[PDB]
Design a protein around this ligand. Structure first.
Ligand code: GNP
Ligand code: MG
Length: 155
């Protein structure tokens, strides 16, 4: 009965499709197969006795209730690029949209080049919540989507 549209955004190597494929199929690919077109899948959840249909839109590289802005923790450049989307989404929809700033590939912690403090403090500064995930190890994905849904219900 709750119906939310959520979009995944981020640079070309951050793992947008990998997050969705793991969450929805329990699968993961080492090959980067670049997304040529936006596509959706619907996740059904019950939260607080309420049914939720979550339309998750993956993107090729105004409607949305939430946006998942994915970066690669080993790639500083991928993190800074998130900030453009934040600026654009905030200009468009203000604080209405639930923003997630997601550091993916936490399995590659050994090669981290984005500071967690900067990531989290930046997230807070734009009214966003920060999240850590790995599509490869299936960590933090269940909770990302769940938390985003809870947050989208609060309005
Ligand atoms: N180690 C590790 N590699 C990951 C993780 N998530 C994705 N990758 C890798 O990152 C690469 C890009 O993944 P992909 O999901 O295709 O990214 P995308 O954001 O959809 N790219 P595009 O914009 O081209 O569609 C792949 O080689 C994939 O295996 C992760 O959590 N850990
Ligand atoms: Mg993709």
């Amino acid at each position: 009965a709750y119906s939310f549209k959520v979009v995944l955004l981020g640079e070309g190597c951050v793992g947008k499709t990998s997050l969705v494929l793991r969450y929805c199929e329990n699968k993961f690919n080492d090959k980067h197969i670049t997304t040529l077109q936006a596509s959706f899948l619907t996740k059904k959840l019950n939260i607080g006795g309420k049914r939720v249909n979550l339309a998750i839109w993956d993107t090729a590289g105004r409607d949305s209730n939430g946006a998942i802005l994915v970066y690669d923790i080993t790639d500083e450049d991928s993190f800074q690029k998130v900030k453009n989307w934040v600026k654009e989404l905030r200009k468009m929809l203000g604080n209405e949209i639930c923003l997630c700033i997601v550091g993916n590939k936490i399995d590659l912690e050994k090669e981290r080049h984005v500071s967690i403090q900067e990531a989290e403090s930046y997230a807070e500064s734009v009214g966003a919540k920060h999240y850590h995930t790995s599509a490869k190890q299936n960590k933090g994905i269940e909770e990302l989507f769940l938390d985003l849904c809870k947050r989208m219900i609060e309005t």
